[PDB]
Every structure is written in structure tokens, then in C-alpha cells.
């Protein structure tokens, strides 16, 4: 038997993922001291 409709469940998460503090950053780091920032617990937009 075939499925009837598709359901997608994502959480609410009332914040956009802050890629603006890692992409639009005035001081990018160096390669011996590369800045690592974990981004989590949000809804991300990869279309931009």
C-alpha cells in the first residue's frame, strides 16, 4: 500500500541561526589560530 500524503515535522525554535556573526565578520581569523564557532539550536536558511 502506497502513502497518501507526506508530513514534515520540524521544531518551533524562535530564532534564526546567526550566520551573520561568522560570514559578515570584520575580523576573520588566521590559519594557525582558526576561529571555531559552533552554531546550534535554531532554524537555518541555506538559500541565502
Amino acid at each position: 500500500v502506497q502513502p497518501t500524503e507526506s508530513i514534515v515535522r520540524f521544531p518551533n525554535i524562535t530564532n534564526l541561526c546567526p550566520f551573520g556573526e561568522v560570514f559578515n565578520a570584520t575580523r576573520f581569523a588566521s590559519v594557525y589560530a582558526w576561529n571555531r564557532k559552533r552554531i546550534s539550536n535554531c532554524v537555518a536558511d541555506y538559500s541565502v
Partner: antibody
Amino acid sequence: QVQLVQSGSELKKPGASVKVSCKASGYTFTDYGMNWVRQAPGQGLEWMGWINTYSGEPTYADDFRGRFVFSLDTSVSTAYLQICSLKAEDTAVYYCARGGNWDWYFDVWGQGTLVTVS
Amino acid sequence: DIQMTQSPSSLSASVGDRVTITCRASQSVSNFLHWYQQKPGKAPKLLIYYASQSISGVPSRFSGSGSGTDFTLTISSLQPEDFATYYCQQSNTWPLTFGQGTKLEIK
């Protein structure tokens, strides 16, 4: 002696196109960039973008992506900005700023271009 | 996009006292928050760069401190002739936004 002299107080129609000047002297002009901020008298400083000394690409800010145009004329030490299609909400001064690519603090120096529109 | 607020809006102080003004951040400006002041009818001048260091050639009656999202400078010896509107400036994320200002006033 390092200083950044400016143009005078401009007064034009809402829709004219005026070009303000920022003449530099004293330092290595190709070394540090030519940042520009705006300040309404009831508000604070707002950065509008900059332009590199060697290529001339006018990279604006995230808000003022439109009618602001930076114009470069090298080997005479000028940092010309031009505003076109002026609006009545742009009653603000336009401060020029020598500002480097790495340190990114200003030491902004402009005597005040009183761009009054009515 | 980065909302840079600072409190109190209008606080008064007297001659020779010690005052503390803050600058509260919404997002992370972890080290890059600079300090300016603006006299009326005057192009501004640096006070504290990189939130701890002081520029050479300023009167050192004040020092800046703080990290994270809370930043301050403390005027250890206040003088009446300033009447300056203190300005915040972050150097971390584009666009470079500023603060509204803490106007210092005499009683």
C-alpha cells in the same frame, strides 16, 4: 600633519546630485582606506561602506546598498562621494574617515558637511 | 542588525566623583567594542580601543574593562568641562553600528 579636509555646507533640491570631496595629505594614501559615516542630529553615527585605495570597488553597507556611490580619483589623494536622488529624510552630516583594512577603528576626522535639504 | 544599547540615558554627576556607565549587547561582540565621545559641534575622538587598551595621547583619567556582552569604562576623576555624549562602537560584525549616547550633566 595628517588631516582630512572636506567640502562646504551643501543645500540642494530633493532630487539633485551633489558630489562631496575628501582631500587627504600627510600620510601614505594607498595604505589606509577611506571609510564614510553618516550622523543625523537626533541620532548617532551610521556606517555606509568603504572603497579600497588600489582597485576602486565601492563596497557599501548592508543598509545603504543603493543610491550612495563612492568615486575614486587616484594619484591626487581624493576620496569623493556622490549622493544622487536625494530625499528629505537625509538631513545628516557626512564624515570622511581614513580607516585601515585590519585595525578597523576609525580616527574619523571631518569638520562637517552640513547637507541640509528642504 | 546588532542592537547596541547603553544605560542610563541621562545621568548626572558632580565635580571630582567616580561614575560608571555601561553598554549592553544583544549578540556577541566579545572583545570588539570601542569607546568614543562627542562634544557638541565636534568631530569625535577615540577613548578606549579593543575594550581594554588606551590610545596614546589621551588624558588617562579613565580606563575601560569588560568582556562578553557587558562592557564599561570608569571615569576615576571627572571634570566639569567635558559635557560629552559617550558613544559605543563594535568592530566585530558588519555593519558597524553605534550607540545612542549617555549625556553627562551637572546638577
